[PDB]
């Protein structure tokens, strides 16, 4: 249907505004603490303290699948990134601070990409 078509075209578009939005926030982490998944060969025991895991590359694999239909499930997994950290980690490591950083940086540019999917629908 043409339907189908015209709300593809819109998804592709929704993914290449969460692409330059991933990009960004990728940016705000120039130690590349948050780029790939904790190793459970290092931390062996990461998933008995967190259930839901959560980094840039595996948020990368997802947008690329167009596995994101709207800004709130890719902020979702934006925030996880950050709150598993910061319960992992106490709050005296390079890597809690890492993601207090991430987050208050973010905001700013999760705050105008909120903007750019309500204006351009």
């Known amino acids: 249907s043409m339907e189908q078509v015209a709300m593809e075209l819109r998804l592709t578009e929704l993914t290449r505004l969460l692409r330059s939005v991933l990009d960004q926030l990728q940016d705000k982490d120039p130690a590349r603490i948050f780029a790939q998944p904790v190793s459970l060969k290092e931390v062996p025991d990461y998933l008995d303290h ?63 990409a909120r903007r750019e999917v309500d204006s351009i629908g």
């Open 50 to 112: 967190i259930k839901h895991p959560m980094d840039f590359a595996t948020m990368r694999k997802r947008l690329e699948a167009q596995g994101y239909k709207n800004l709130h499930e890719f902020e979702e997994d934006f925030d996880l990134i950050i709150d598993n950290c910061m319960k992992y980690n106490a709050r005296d490591t390079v890597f809690y601070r890492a993601a207090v950083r991430l987050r208050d940086q973010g905001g700013v540019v999760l705050r105008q």
